Chains A and B, each alone.
Chain A
Amino acid sequence: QVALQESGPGLVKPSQSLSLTCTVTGYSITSDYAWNWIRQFPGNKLEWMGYIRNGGSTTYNPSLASRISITRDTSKNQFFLQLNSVTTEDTATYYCARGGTGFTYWGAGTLVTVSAAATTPPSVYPLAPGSAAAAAAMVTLGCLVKGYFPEPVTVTWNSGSLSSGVHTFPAVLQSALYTLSSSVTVPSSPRPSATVTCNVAHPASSTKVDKKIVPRDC
């Protein structure tokens, strides 16, 4: 089928120019169809930025028209977005999409942050309970991933074996950086015998951590 996939910068300074790259698989971007760039701001809001047509014509949004440029590379089968003079209001998550009878095939969407800040890797701390050998027949261990820039981070438990009883909480910005945590609930039996480990990944900084949940003293 049609498989769009955007890539490119994650965090870029202000007044600078952004440049994403959407690569499509399973359909030439030169035989029928509109090839779009749509952006989704934090929360709920969608904004169609424009598109590169089959013939290679362009129709931008009358408001970003003075700042953007959508070109293509017909041999690599990829079209690219270019956002100049990026203000901090421009930070959002970007998608490339096929357009004919509505927008049909959307890309995974890559998030772009416009901040004067700097990339700082996370401090991952393991959260163990302090009170005998748990509470009931259920134990909830957790993990605090604090101080990292910018979003996102990916946390899993024991490489994905612990796929249930998991809760990952949305990050909140603590001044110039974020903090995230994630709990996991399991029975008191496979808690200290079996060993659980939270594994965090902060792509933008190429940091991958495997912190273990050890029982606090007693």
Chain B
Amino acid sequence: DIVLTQSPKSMSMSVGERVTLSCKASENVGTYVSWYQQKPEQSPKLLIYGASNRYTGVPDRFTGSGSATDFTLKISSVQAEDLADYHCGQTYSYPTFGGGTKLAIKRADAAPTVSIFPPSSEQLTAGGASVVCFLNNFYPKDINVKWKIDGSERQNGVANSWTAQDSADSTYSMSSTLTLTKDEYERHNSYTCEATHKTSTSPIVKSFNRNEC
């Protein structure tokens, strides 16, 4: 059932660079291959149809060649705005899509900006208690956050979430949330969050003591 295959599952690229993705058909699809662009929380957008034809409003920096089986897509100069997943699909037999190539932008190192928040008053009354901690605007994506209530490491109850790249500056932002029962929160003192990024020889550690008004 005509399988299509996109190559670089993912790529990092500077600006002005020459990108080149690749899509492959399993059995001759002719020239009925089209490229779509999917940005964060947006519907795909047609880019090239007919294997070689650009659409409307689609900037020149996007061009496609290819025929029966081997298809490709180029970007003369990658711009910050060119951040998104790129799919392809054949419209010959039954429409089947590729696997999508997620393309991210290569910027320079940037250390996160951490900020830990104490669990809100009402939430305690509500029974629970969450210590939040934001790691904002850093790069590269690789970061390791470690919670330590009263010196000891807590790996149970933590929930991490990250954001998609860019944000007009091509950086990321993580968030860790340690969730305890009130009692337990009420029988400990220092609540520290310890991010260990590569733009820092030692780790950045924010903290707060359950005893300071």
The residues of A with any CB-CB pair to B shorter than 8 Å are 36, 38, 44-48, 59, 61-62, 95, 99, 101-104, 106-109, 123, 125-131, 140, 142, 144, 146, 167-172, 174, 179-181, 183, 185, 216-218
Contact = CB atoms under 8 A, between A and B. Distances in A.
Interface stretch (B66-74, B97-105, B146-154): B97-105
Given A46-B97, A128-B117, A217-B213, A167 B173 contact: yes
B160 interface: yes
Interface string B134-162: 10100000000000000000000001111
Interface string B91-111: 100111101101000000000
Contacts of B163: 167-170
7 contacts: A47-B97, A102-B50, A125-B123, A128-B117, A167-B173, A168-B163, A169-B161
Given A44-B87, A46-B97, A167-B175, 6 more contacts: A44-B102, A102-B34, A144-B123, A168-B163, A169-B162, A169-B175
Given A169-B175, A172-B160, A140 B95 contact: no
Nearest to B121: A216
A95 B85 contact: no
B136 A167 contact: yes
B115 A129 contact: yes
A168 B173 CA distance: 9
Given A102-B34, A102-B91, A140-B134, A48 B175 contact: no
B interface, by DSSP: helix, strand, loop or mixed?
strand
Given A106-B44, A128-B117, A167-B136, A172 B159 contact: yes
Contacts of B208: 130-131
Contacts of B53: 101
A106 B87 CA distance: 14
A146 B132 CA distance: 12
A126 B120 contact: yes
A52 to B, nearest CB: 14
B43 A146 contact: no
Contacts of B1: 62
B134 to A, nearest CB: 5
Nearest to B44: A106
Given A95-B43, A144-B132, A181-B177, A48 B97 contact: yes
Given A48-B94, A167-B163, A171-B161, A216 B134 contact: no
A130 B134 contact: no
A144 B177 contact: yes
Contacts of B134: 140, 142, 167, 183
Contacts of B102: 44
Interface in B158-207: 159-163, 167, 173, 175, 177, 179
Contacts of B212: 130-131, 218
